Subunit: 137 residues, 2 copies
């Protein structure tokens, strides 16, 4: 069917760009570098519900994004997850972690309130990510 | 090099068996149905560090495991993640969620100390998972 980004994902993110398969979204919490891939395929709840070739494309994009974010943000560890307990539209979290970050070594989700990006922080991180995003096209 | 299961993973789990690529581990917490895939390749921290063909095999196994667990445990939603902030050996979590389960709708990690399976509970869940384990060969 006709893919439409879920309203909660739209509300919680800024759009960074588009890969071949996915919308590339910045989670609007500047506490951690946090990018979401949303495959533009209607009605998908789980990775396994994608056709095999689209699973493999998502993997290619996710692995390329993760490795690139690690270098770009000088991270200590990646966290990658598909959760979706309250948003049924499949989306894949990519979060750069640091031994010095506020949640370490636990998970980030629900640790503390989000801090929205300022205009200049949003533009800076979008710009920083464009080379990597172009790799995903 | 010579793969060796990380001591913390060994301590926290019961080994169900092996897939083509991985150790298939039961997380030793009966609070949620939770199985961990550990690729049997030394020195890997992140999915993207595997050779592409092992990344694709891990994906296949993860998707087969997840879809199978959903039907076997009558789940509402899967949660799949590679975190590894404490344990550097790549391992991929697969947790069956139900509406209203413990910690719902948040993620499970760090929300309760584990409750070990008793001998009899371990035998039950092992028997329940055996067909699906075999599908990962
Ligand atoms: Ca938005
Ligand atoms: Ca292919
Ligand atoms: Ca063990």
């Amino acid at each position: 069917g006709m893919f439409q980004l879920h309203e909660r994902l739209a509300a919680d993110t800024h759009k960074l760009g588009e890969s071949r398969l996915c919308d590339v979204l910045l989670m609007n919490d500047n506490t951690w570098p946090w990018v979401i891939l949303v495959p533009r395929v209607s009605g998908i709840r789980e990775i396994y519900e994608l056709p095999n070739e689209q699973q493999q494309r998502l993997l290619f994009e996710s692995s390329a994004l993760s490795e690139g974010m690690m270098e770009l943000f000088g991270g200590d560890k990646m966290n990658v997850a598909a959760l979706g307990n309250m948003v049924p539209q499949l989306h894949l979290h990519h979060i750069v972690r640091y031994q010095g970050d506020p949640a370490w070594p636990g998970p980030v989700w629900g640790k503390q309130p989000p801090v929205p990006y300022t205009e200049e922080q949003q533009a800076s991180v979008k710009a920083k990510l464009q080379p990597l995003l172009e790799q995903l096209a």
